[PDB]
Symmetry: D2
Subunit: 256 residues, 4 copies
């Protein structure tokens, strides 16, 4: 089954940044034909810590940029919504509607995403036990979603720290396809980078259906997640490595 | 003065709200020293199961709360779940409540501040005490003047919440602090026996108010049945925390 | 029932330090007659982080100093043991044998303490759930202990941090007398001081049978726990406050 | 070379030790690339219950391990619980194992180093990865030269352990790192189904060896029955981690 790689800059800082990253992703999709790539970027960071941090350029602008990426490269698209009303407009361009970790339990947002007919990817809340994502998936099916993903992005471990409990991959696999978020799982809420690659290797060795990675031409200048966004030039090598580890580990993946 | 926010978890019916409102009114008359605020949610927006009780709607709920504020002259507070609900709710609500999961949603906070009403944010289970500083700033930026931060527990492994009381003095540096006595002991996903003990700790440590869900018959509650306090037990607990506070206040640190 | 106050310098830095603190504790015992005071100090810090930190002056020296305190002031004594063989010699002076948090599950150390006929106080491990102290008490009874205490000293909460779950007081009270350790519960493993008094108020409001506090004439010069040891001149006020909070909260203590 | 430490949890009888030793010997002959070490405890010093199996004593245990080292020529490792046991154990044990709870007991570490043998410390459930640096220093001070740190999980709420794999590269800065595949998934106080998945993660991330308890019939084990790996399953798992390591080693960071 085709492995999923969801990647892109954290925030749609501009339509130019989007096309620049989109070009590299299109190139990788041509090389890694056994992979299904999905371009990701948020039209809005609705929950930055500080009121002074970069949020975005609006839904309208974001959707237009994302659509430009899709038209120009033939890339599938995914972006996250924050309130029910955003589902409809976003569904016009997004192949996969993403649900933020903090909102994984908001019934109406989930129902709004499901009725669009698009695929839905829910980031598992940092407060949520893996066995409790069962009802999240149940809500989505109830709302009409036929293609569902659950994304592992770490769990609250003391203050300002997240730990990844890899037991969650096979548990959530019982009711949905599982994606490992390599970027936000090492982030210190409220170092980090050096742990991205090692945990990604662990994820594919344990077994998942896809990986999610934020990447930017020059992370040091990103308007959000600068410290954890992967340098764009490193994406190819990371992908090649996980496909290699995936292949050799695959014969041992347990049947759920 | 000391704040006591109480009421049934969900607006099961304006009838139930009036029965609880009557008692809160009575206690209100008995403890003139305490500022009571009637609380109840018009919608349980994040029940684990799709097949659970959510409520009767915003309109029916606002109308029911209006009836309590009118019949008993009590202050009101209910929680909002999306930005568009702030204004209609602000018609009745004296204090707008922000759910713990949504404590970081900038637009929800700004829409709350914009109504001019008081705003009470439940500290997320994922949030460090010192990180509530930015939450308060967003509300100030948005024009909020009366701001409350409510302690409701912190994620401790799976399906468990622990109350780190160090948070009370930390959050107090930038806002009035309320202690949520009922959601702080519930396991997410012994509960009741621990509500009063931890309530006593909160007042011994020092807080500006206490938040408690109460129901005539918690057993039959449509939400949080396991943790809602029997209405008949409310007076005794209020008297107990006022006596403890009277003695302990002598030692509350300045900060 | 007489409230227990266990206090003293963390480590027996010298016999002079011991007599100096012992004098203040004797004075307080005369004032607070409704309190049972127990003088505490370790003849050895058997698990400092660094091999270079202060450990002590030996079992022999320590026991002799502790005995001097007992003879000179009529104060009850408590100190901790680290290996089974230490129980016998230590029992000659200690009225209460303390079991370190990390060793709360070592069957032989527990059995060695119990057969001395002395009272035993076990610090609850930072890894231990409160309902699991039941078997610790069972082991002690099996070994002959008739007077047992369980001491709350925090729980592992992420890295380098402890949280106090006050629900543990009424749970452990089901099988033993409970003591709240005001000093080590705010310590950051591997600020702190400002939280000592507030958490002590919480402990007595919830309800316990005693409090444990480390105190030193000049904390800033202590050879161990300098940051969290309470200034000796502050002890009287802390004790007075907890007796006041205890009295007003007492009528509400639940029956276990 | 890669380390594989395996054996039954408790020395239930030198007989059982010989049956397991035979298989480890065979695998030893099959995977010449791997350094096998036979492991078994002569005493379960911290069972929750006083009415549980502890063992048959240090003398009986050392004798039984001696029989394995003699009959099969395999290296040995057992854990000590108090300082006085280091020397007698060092007669047979090639590697002295320090229990996770006692990883901070200076005298136990020093007595272990003094025997001149190799020392493997299980990282406490309460210990941060970076704080293992001082543990290693105590052993060096004590004369230890071959030092191992073993990852066995971290306290995550009550009765639960989580494995933070970030610890593998952190501890590796000052010692060889071993991953304990069996105690890392046990709940203190799904287990088995998670042993192999996490073992795969450990080798994908990078470690110098793996630790696994195995028993001919775990169901009948006198200790850790729920988590000991069936002896017949050991070969397949070893082959699996060698293949994963062969491919993943290309990407292990230098550090």
């Amino acid at each position: 089954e085709k492995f999923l790689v969801i990647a892109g800059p954290c925030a749609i800082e501009s339509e130019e940044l989007l096309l620049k990253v989109g070009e590299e992703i299109k190139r990788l999709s041509e090389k890694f034909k056994e992979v299904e790539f999905v371009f990701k970027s948020s039209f809005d960071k609705a929950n930055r810590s500080s009121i002074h941090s970069f949020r975005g350029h609006g839904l309208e602008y974001g959707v237009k940029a994302l659509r430009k990426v899709k038209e120009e490269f033939g890339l599938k698209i995914t972006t996250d919504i924050h309130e029910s009303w955003q589902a409809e407009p976003v569904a016009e361009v997004a192949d996969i509607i993403q649900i933020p970790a903090f909102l994984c339990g908001q019934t109406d947002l989930l129902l709004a995403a499901a009725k669009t007919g698009r695929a839905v990817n829910v980031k598992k809340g940092q407060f949520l036990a893996p066995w409790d994502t069962k009802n999240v998936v149940e809500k989505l099916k109830f709302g009409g979603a036929k293609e569902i993903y659950l994304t592992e992005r770490g769990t609250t471990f003391g203050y300002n720290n997240l730990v990844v409990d890899f037991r969650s991959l096979p548990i959530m696999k019982q009711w949905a396809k599982v994606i490992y978020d390599a970027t936000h799982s090492v982030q210190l809420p409220g170092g980090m980078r050096e742990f991205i690659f090692p945990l990604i290797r662990a994820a594919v060795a344990v077994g998942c259906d896809g990986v999610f990675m934020e990447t930017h031409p020059e992370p040091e200048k990103a308007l959000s997640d600068a410290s954890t966004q992967l340098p764009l030039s490193q994406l190819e090598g990371i992908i090649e490595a996980i496909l290699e580890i995936r292949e050799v580990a695959s014969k041992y993946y347990e049947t759920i």
